[PDB]
Amino acid sequence: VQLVESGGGLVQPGGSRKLSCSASGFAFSSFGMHWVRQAPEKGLEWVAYISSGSGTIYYADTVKGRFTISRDDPKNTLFLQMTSLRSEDTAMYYCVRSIYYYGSSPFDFWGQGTTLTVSSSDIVMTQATSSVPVTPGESVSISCRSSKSLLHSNGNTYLYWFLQRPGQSPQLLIYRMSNLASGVPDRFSGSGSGTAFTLTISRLEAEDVGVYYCMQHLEYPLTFGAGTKLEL
Amino acid sequence: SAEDKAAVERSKMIDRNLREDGEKAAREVKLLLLGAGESGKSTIVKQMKITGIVETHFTFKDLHFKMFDVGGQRSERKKWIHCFEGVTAIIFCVALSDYDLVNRMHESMKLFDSICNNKWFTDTSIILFLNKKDLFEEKIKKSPLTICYPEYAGSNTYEEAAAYIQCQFEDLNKRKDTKEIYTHFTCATDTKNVQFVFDAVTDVIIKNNLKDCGLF
Amino acid sequence: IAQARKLVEQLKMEANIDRIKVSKAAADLMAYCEAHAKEDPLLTPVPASENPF
Amino acid sequence: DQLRQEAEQLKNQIRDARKACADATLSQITNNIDPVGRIQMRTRRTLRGHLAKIYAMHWGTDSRLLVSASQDGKLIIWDSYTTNKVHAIPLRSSWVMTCAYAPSGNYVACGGLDNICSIYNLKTREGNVRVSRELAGHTGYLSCCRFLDDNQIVTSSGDTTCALWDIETGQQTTTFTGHTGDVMSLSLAPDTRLFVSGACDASAKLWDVREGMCRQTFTGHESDINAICFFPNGNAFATGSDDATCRLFDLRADQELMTYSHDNIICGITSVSFSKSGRLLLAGYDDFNCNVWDALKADRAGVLAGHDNRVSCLGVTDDGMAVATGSWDSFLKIWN
Amino acid sequence: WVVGMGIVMSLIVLAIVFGNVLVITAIAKFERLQTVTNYFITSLACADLVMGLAVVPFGAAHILTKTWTFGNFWCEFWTSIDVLCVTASIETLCVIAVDRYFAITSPFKYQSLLTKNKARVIILMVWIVSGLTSFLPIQMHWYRATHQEAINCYAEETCCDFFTNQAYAIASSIVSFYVPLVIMVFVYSRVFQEAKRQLQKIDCLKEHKALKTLGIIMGTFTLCWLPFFIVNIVHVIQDNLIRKEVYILLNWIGYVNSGFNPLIYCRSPDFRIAFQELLC
Ligand SMILES: COc1ccc(Sc2ccc(S(=O)(=O)N(C)C(C)C)cc2C(=O)N[C@@H](CC(=O)NCC(=O)O)Cc2ccc(C(C)(C)C)cc2)cc1
Ligand SMILES: Oc1ccc([C@@H](O)CNCCCCCCOCCCCc2ccccc2)cc1O
Ligand SMILES: CC(C)CCC[C@@H](C)[C@H]1CC[C@H]2[C@@H]3CC=C4C[C@@H](O)CC[C@]4(C)[C@H]3CC[C@]12C
Ligand SMILES: CC(C)CCC[C@@H](C)[C@H]1CC[C@H]2[C@@H]3CC=C4C[C@@H](O)CC[C@]4(C)[C@H]3CC[C@]12C
Ligand SMILES: CC(C)CCC[C@@H](C)[C@H]1CC[C@H]2[C@@H]3CC=C4C[C@@H](O)CC[C@]4(C)[C@H]3CC[C@]12C
């Protein structure tokens, strides 16, 4: 399983760009695809979404009318066409697969992304702390807050906790606020109630340092938190 | 109703695929093949282009035929025959040169009677093939036919012996107003069984279409 | 004659089995049925606020 | 040979110590309790995606997912709450006859007239369901399949033999050969230490999984039997034959305990299932409708008349929410 | 007198609406009934549904009150929609007959070229040609009956009577009834030829069912709409022969054929199951 992005680089202001995401190792036709970007000095920010079968396309306010998404199933690629680029688009873009059925774990695999440098009612997610120094071997807890209740009437909370290591692409830690992803050690855990969530790590080890992120999936657009940097 | 919309879209795509497959699998003719011990069931398969259940696929005049042979699997036939209810036709094979071997033709007639009067096949047509005609030509000139049919009274030669056998076949089915039995004579050579199968299937399909519209 | 010895051995193995009274078995089945009647949604209908269907 | 009369007198001795312990029937002890009354179940959901005769299905352990297979050549996974299709798996041999669902929810099993039991893996890293194993070695059609653990599986085949396998290697770990006809159905105990099977011999056998040898034999039916299920306590089971009757046997007493039948029904049974409390017994018939009996008083409690053809499969969730019935009509329905 | 006739008028309105809405709902809801053939049936139901909505009730208002409560717009719209629905229904029946003929004659070759696109094209062509003979010649006043009574009833605001010249009284009847009748009778005779040949090949007792089915199918369509479509030719062929009362009576006898059609063309077992499910 791998996703390889291409097309990034230096773009003059107001120009156009065409980003490609090639998939291999899985059935690309059964996966919805998200484009999500991260600023060089800020947190992540959801950009665009395309469903399985090109039925549904979703954008954000900052990108609507300028960014369009498409896919090629026989050639197994995802495409993002960007027009009228502004200085606010300087970022690092990630191509994320996501599959939706009963019990699935969306936002599990992320690509390596590509860089883009340009010359020159939404639910609010907040992180209490920006940096926490803790010696290895102890237990840590990190809190995220929301401006609205995330508990839908069906009975599940659509909260996601991710990690980005230094110099690495993100990865899914826990999905739906209480379910651990695959390939993740059991020491991680998450809990909480309406508009107050806590991610708890016990028996801290090496390579756990990085940045933790909290995101909601109650409605579009999906809003990212500030992210807490855990460093020695 | 937040990310359940994607689940609904996935279900709709699955429904579309299922419907397309079902439409594609409804215009394809399915025939069920039956024979006996060394009755030539494998012989007829040679003329067409071509475990427990054997499936053969072929095409003739832009028509797709799937022949299902069940002779490999031996078990209680009562417990799995109804899986083949709704086939277009039953291809029965009978060896014409087994009148004196051993008794064999009596068993073949018993099996034909048993298969022709099933509640699941109360409205299914039978295409009957008669093999080993060439050997039967000279197998009757040196031995009387009365060995297998003691109550027979006729001259011993092929021309009316074959007709007597064919008429003996037809006197088994009790659903004469519901199904029609097609009989053919063939040998290892003279490849003309495909035309017979095509014509019988065409007639059966026309009859079913007539029955659908309220007529017939 | 090959399977006759096997059949005799199998039936002899099946011969020595301890058996309990049928009345005790009926009492046990009835007791199990009675002790779990509360958590039987089909036996006792529950209010529609608890039905997932 | 004296062995014939030796076996005859041995069978006579077996039947000698089978009625001395039958002081009283299940009735005359259950007559004092009050009856269930009337059961009025309604079709909450109707799952309509199949285009042929549905032959088997199985409930998931979470009691929200199920799997169903038909002659169309596909088996699909239903979300029983929102009426959604999670997976649709096309199999090579369209002559399906049985289904199974792994208790962990990771694997599914199949098998029909191709003499092969196929094991499919649902949770893969590539996003699709792929066939994980093809158990081969039977000479008759696969009639039933049950999962013991994530790696073991017991199968019943139309060649008189049952087989406990080992999916990791693919070889028959144990073979059970004690019948003279075709084994039709299968059911596992709650503790997965022993199981029971029933055959066209009008008889059922109790097999120990570990030792791989038959323990007890149950008779009393007059025709081929097609359905087996254990009581929730694991100390009794129920059978349904072409005789248009059902009956419940006891393991400890080791004979018939009580039969359920009515004069109106003349058509055979196709499926059997129980309820959590063990008070009402489901039964699917060829009359195109299924019945609900009072398992203790032997009384017709209800009728789930909602199908157009014979009901072929029937199941009850682990938590007792609902009961699903599937028929040759190509529609399976959920009743609550 | 008036009460009973009004009651029976309301009854036929209710029956037509109920049948059409039942058929349309049954076809639209379930997915197994969306075959290429059933599409044609759907069209028929549509051409019948408007009967219970914008033709028969307006005629009831016009007849019971003995005057037109609207003026110079709803009269023309009512007439145009009536002609549209009648033509669409008849041509849908003709298309159903032709489809049955092609299915009976050569099944294998026919089912390989009956794509849903072709069925949609055929239905659209039927409805377009039905519209061309109803709205185009009426809204543009292409008939324009020319005599004293015609001008008098064109002028004032309460005479909503339909007056036609030699043209549009011949061509409209030809397109609406005569060409479809010829096509249907030729098709059904040809189909009956093989329906009898197949029965005689096996050998006579089962031919009675074929005769009964053909007789019902043709008679219900002909006995309802033939007297009206011959008096329609006659009253312009020779005047002072037909009064308005018999004209209205025959037109309503033609109208009830629409309510008849669902009971005839929707006897498939799938349709029966769908109807039973809908009405419990
Ligand atoms: C009311 O239900 C209808 C359904 C379909 C049609 S259509 C049609 C019908 C019969 C024939 S048949 O070959 O004579 N035929 C008797 C065979 C079955 C043996 C050909 C076409 C056809 O498709 N002909 C094509 C030629 C073609 O593609 N193949 C000829 C062939 O297969 O021989 C030309 C054509 C197509 C479509 C139209 C309209 C606009 C009316 C839809 C007109 C003409 C019409 C009505
Ligand atoms: O192509 C055709 C298709 C369909 C139709 C029918 O639907 C006609 N429906 C419209 C008639 C509305 C009912 C009341 C109008 O009453 C006015 C009587 C004057 C007629 C008359 C003239 C001379 C002498 C006596 C009577 C007609 C078509 O021509
Ligand atoms: C004056 C008013 C009544 C005109 C209304 C136009 C309606 C009744 C006509 C015009 C186009 C017609 C449709 C043409 C295309 C389709 C899609 C096909 O898959 C089923 C029939 C169906 C749905 C037809 C139903 C009737 C239809 C919708
Ligand atoms: C009555 C009229 C106005 C409306 C009904 C039109 C339909 C039912 C009739 C009118 C002309 C007919 C067509 C006449 C010409 C052809 C082309 C020929 O190669 C095959 C038959 C075919 C395709 C006929 C199909 C049926 C047909 C299209
Ligand atoms: C159900 C649908 C598909 C029927 C469509 C039929 C079309 C061809 C018919 C129905 C309505 C008709 C129009 C009705 C109103 C007008 C405006 C009038 O001043 C001149 C005729 C004209 C322009 C007609 C042209 C033909 C017309 C557009």
Residue numbers in the entry:
A (entry chain E): 2 to 121, 124 to 235
B (entry chain A): 6 to 55, 182 to 233, 241 to 354
C (entry chain C): 9 to 61
D (entry chain B): 5 to 340
E (entry chain R): 32 to 234, 265 to 341
Could you pull the original sentences from the published paper?
The β2-adrenergic receptor is an example of GPCR with high selectivity for Gαs, the stimulatory G protein for adenylyl cyclase, and much weaker for the Gαi family of G proteins inhibiting adenylyl cyclase. In contrast, β2AR activation of Gαi has a cardioprotective effect by activating the PI3K-Akt signaling cascade. In this work, we identified a Gαi-biased agonist (LM189) for the β2AR and investigated the mechanism for its signaling bias using a combination of structural and biophysical methods. We observed that relative to nonbiased agonists, LM189 stabilizes a distinct conformation in TM6 and increases the dynamics of ICL2, explaining the preferential Gαi bias mediated by LM189 at this receptor system.
The overall structure of the LM189-β2AR-Gi complex is similar to the previously determined BI-167107–β2AR-Gs crystal structure. The position of the α5 helix in the β2AR-Gi structure closely resembles the β2AR-Gs complex, in contrast to other GPCR-Gi complexes such as the μOR-Gi. Conversely, TM6 of the receptor in the β2AR-Gi complex displays a larger outward movement, more similar to the one observed in the β2AR-Gs structure rather than the smaller TM6 opening reported for other GPCR-Gi structures. However, by monitoring TM6 helix rotation at residue Glu 2686.28, we observed a slightly smaller outward rotation in the β2AR-Gi complex compared to Gs, resulting in a ~3-Å difference in the outward tilt of Glu 2686.28. Similar to the β2AR-Gs structure, Phe 13934.51 of β2AR ICL2 inserts into the hydrophobic pocket of Gi, formed by Phe 191 and Leu 194 of the β1 strand, Phe 336, Thr 340, Ile 343, Ile 344 of the α5 C terminus. However, compared to the Gs structure, engagement of Gi to the β2AR is mediated by far fewer contacts between the G protein α5 and ICL2, TM3, and TM5 of the receptor, accounting for the diminished efficacy and less stable interaction of the β2AR with Gi. LM189 shares the same tail region as salmeterol, making similar hydrophobic and van der Waals interactions within the β2AR exosite. LM189 also shares the same catechol head group of epinephrine, which forms hydrogen bonds with Asp 1133.32, Asn 3127.39, Ser 2035.42, Ser 2075.46 and Asn 2936.55. In our β2AR-Gi complex, ICL2 forms a partial helix. However this might be due to the presence of the cmpd-6FA PAM, which binds on top of ICL2 and stabilizes the helical conformation.
